[PDB]
C-alpha cells in the first residue's frame, strides 16, 4: 500500500506515488522528476491529473505517451493554486526538470518536499528565504558522514583534461560515456565541446535529450555515429567485452577507447582525491569511474537542514531498515542540538 511518507496531510495530494493503483482520496498526483523509481506505474492509460515541471511534462507526453489532457505543467518560482491549495515548484539541482515542492496548507502549516536534490547554498536565496517551514520530506540517500564527494565543477574539469590529453596524443582514440537515465548530461557535453565533436547516440536517447529544453541542443548532439568521436552507450555495455565489441563496430576508424562511468558514491572516495583517480585498463581500453553526484553529500545536506530549521523531518530514502532509520534520526538530533532549533 502507499507509504505514509508519499502522502501530504491535509490535502488530497500524493508525491511520486504511481504504482499503487487508485490511491483512496487522492485528487492530484505530483511527479518530482523523470526517474523510473519515481514515475513507476505511469502510462498512456492514466486518467488522473499529474502536476510537474514543463520538462517532466515533455518526457511524459513523448516517452510514456501520457495523454495531454492529464498533464499539468507549472512554471518554477511562481505561486500557483492547485485544487484550492497554494504551491510553488523550485529547482532541485538534480536531473533536468527535477523540482522540490512547497505546499501552503489551509491550516497555516508549510511543507517542503525535496524530491531528489543536491543541496546548494543558492537555495538559501530562493523563495524559501521568505517564510518558515514546519515539515521537511527529505532526500536522505547519502545521510552518513562517510559520504564525501567533490564538486560537480571539479569532476568535469578532470574529465575534460583527461579526454583532451588522450585524443591529442592519439587522434584515433574514441571516447565513450555510459548512461541509463536522464541526468549528468554535463559529463558528455563538456567532453564533446573540448574535442569539437557532436555527441553521437541512439535514436531513443536522442529523442529523450530533445525534450529537455537545453539551449542550442541541435548543435551539440547527433544520431550519426560515424561523424562523431564521443559515443553514448547503455551503462550496461561499459565494460571490456561490451567496449571491444563496440570497437569492432566502428570499422577500423579507431584503435583505442577511453570510457567514463559516472557513478554515484563509491568507497575509493573515502581514500582518494579526484586529482589522483586512475582507470582500469585492458589492452587498448581504459575505463574511468568518476564520482559525479546529483544527490547531496552528508555535509551539504547538513548545511541545508541547519539553515532551514524544520520542526519535523520525514526521510524518503533508506527507510526500509530499522538500522538505517535509527542512524538517520540520530544525525537529525545531533544537527538540531548543535544549531539550537
Ligand atoms: Ni532521481
Domain residue ranges in the chain: 1-147+296-341, 148-295
Instruction: Give Cβ neighbours of residue 62 (< 8 Å, ≥ 6 apart).
Output: 207, 211
Cα 119 to averaged position of ligand 1 atoms, centre (Å):
14
Cα 147 to averaged position of ligand 1 atoms, centre (Å):
17
Say how far apart CA 112 and CA 101 lie, in whole Å: 6
Fold of 1-147+296-341: Metallo-beta-lactamase; Chain A (3.60.15)
Going by the DSSP 8-state scheme, the letter that residue 185 receives in this structure is H
Residue 331 and residue 315 in contact, taking contact as beta carbons nearer than 8 Å: no
Residue 63 and residue 207 in contact, taking contact as beta carbons nearer than 8 Å: yes
Cα 254 to averaged position of ligand 1 atoms, centre (Å):
35
Going by the DSSP 8-state scheme, the letter that residue 67 receives in this structure is -
Q: What is the CA radius of gyration of the chain?
A: 22
Q: Other C-beta atoms within 10 Å of 241: how many?
A: 10
Cα 140 to averaged position of ligand 1 atoms, centre (Å):
12
Question: Strand 173-179 vs strand 221-222: parallel, antiparallel, or unpaired?
Answer: unpaired
Going by the DSSP 8-state scheme, the letter that residue 96 receives in this structure is T
Structure-solving method:
X-ray
Cα 329 to averaged position of ligand 1 atoms, centre (Å):
22
Dihedral (CA of 79, 80, 83, 89) sign:
negative
Going by the DSSP 8-state scheme, the letter that residue 325 receives in this structure is H
The closest alpha carbon to 296, from 98, 139, 126, 112, belongs to 139
CATH number for the domain running over 148-295? 3.40.50.12650
Instruction: Give Cβ neighbours of residue 142 (< 8 Å, ≥ 6 apart).
Output: 265, 293, 295, 296, 297, 298, 301
Beta bridge partners of 74: none
Cα 98 to averaged position of ligand 1 atoms, centre (Å):
8
The closest alpha carbon to 214, from 100, 95, 306, belongs to 95
Beta bridge partners of 86: 81, 104
Going by the DSSP 8-state scheme, the letter that residue 211 receives in this structure is T
Containing H/E element for 156? helix 152-169
Say how far apart CA 52 and CA 58 lie, in whole Å: 10
Residue 45 and residue 33 in contact, taking contact as beta carbons nearer than 8 Å: no
Cα 227 to averaged position of ligand 1 atoms, centre (Å):
32
Give the strands of the sheet with 99-104, arranged side by side: 80-82, 85-91, 99-104, 110-113, 135-138, 312-315
* Residue 179, all three cell numbers: 548512461
The C-alpha angle 294, 292, 56, rounded to 5 degrees, equals 35
Residue 249 and residue 176 in contact, taking contact as beta carbons nearer than 8 Å: no
The closest alpha carbon to 64, from 163, 182, 177, belongs to 182
Enumerate residues with CB within 5 Å of ligand 1 (an ion): 35, 116
Say how far apart CA 269 and CA 237 lie, in whole Å: 24
Cα 233 to averaged position of ligand 1 atoms, centre (Å):
20
Amino acid at each position: 500500500t502507499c507509504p505514509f511518507y508519499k502522502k501530504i496531510p491535509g490535502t488530497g495530494f500524493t508525491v511520486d506515488a504511481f504504482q499503487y493503483g487508485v490511491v483512496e482520496g487522492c485528487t492530484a498526483y505530483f511527479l518530482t522528476h523523470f526517474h523510473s523509481d519515481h514515475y513507476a506505474g505511469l502510462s498512456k492509460h492514466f486518467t488522473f491529473p499529474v502536476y510537474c515541471s514543463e520538462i517532466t511534462g515533455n518526457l511524459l507526453k513523448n516517452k510514456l505517451h501520457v495523454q495531454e489532457q492529464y498533464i499539468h505543467p507549472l512554471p518554477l518560482d511562481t505561486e500557483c493554486i492547485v485544487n484550492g491549495v497554494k504551491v510553488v515548484l523550485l529547482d532541485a539541482n538534480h536531473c533536468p526538470g527535477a523540482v522540490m515542492i512547497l505546499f501552503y496548507l489551509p491550516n497555516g502549516t508549510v511543507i517542503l518536499h525535496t524530491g531528489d536534490f543536491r543541496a546548494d547554498p543558492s537555495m538559501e536565496r530562493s523563495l524559501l528565504a521568505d517564510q518558515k517551514v514546519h515539515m521537511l520530506y527529505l532526500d536522505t540517500t547519502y545521510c552518513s558522514p562517510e559520504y564525501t564527494f567533490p564538486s560537480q565543477q571539479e569532476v568535469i574539469r578532470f574529465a575534460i583534461n583527461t579526454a583532451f590529453e588522450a585524443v591529442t596524443l592519439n587522434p584515433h582514440a574514441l571516447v565513450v560515456c555510459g548512461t541509463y537515465s536522464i541526468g549528468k548530461e554535463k559529463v558528455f557535453l563538456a567532453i564533446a565541446d573540448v574535442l569539437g565533436s557532436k555527441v553521437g547516440m541512439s535514436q531513443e536517447k536522442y529523442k529523450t535529450l530533445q525534450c529537455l529544453n537545453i539551449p542550442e541542443i541541435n548543435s551539440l548532439i547527433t544520431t550519426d555515429m560515424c561523424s562523431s568521436l564521443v559515443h553514448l552507450l547503455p551503462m550496461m555495455q561499459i565494460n571490456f567485452k561490451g567496449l571491444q565489441s563496440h570497437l569492432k563496430k566502428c570499422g577500423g576508424k579507431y584503435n583505442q577507447i577511453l570510457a567514463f562511468r559516472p557513478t554515484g558514491w563509491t568507497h575509493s572516495n573515502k581514500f582518494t582525491r579526484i586529482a589522483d583517480v586512475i582507470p582500469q585498463t585492458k589492452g587498448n581500453i581504459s575505463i574511468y569511474g568518476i564520482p559525479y553526484s546529483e544527490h547531496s553529500s552528508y555535509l551539504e545536506m547538513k548545511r541545508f537542514v541547519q539553515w532551514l530549521k524544520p520542526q519535523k523531518i520525514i526521510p524518503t530514502v533508506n527507510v526500509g531498515t530499522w538500522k538505517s532509520r535509527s542512524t538517520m534520526e540520530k544525525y537529525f538530533r545531533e544537527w538540531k542540538l548543535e544549531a539550537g532549533y
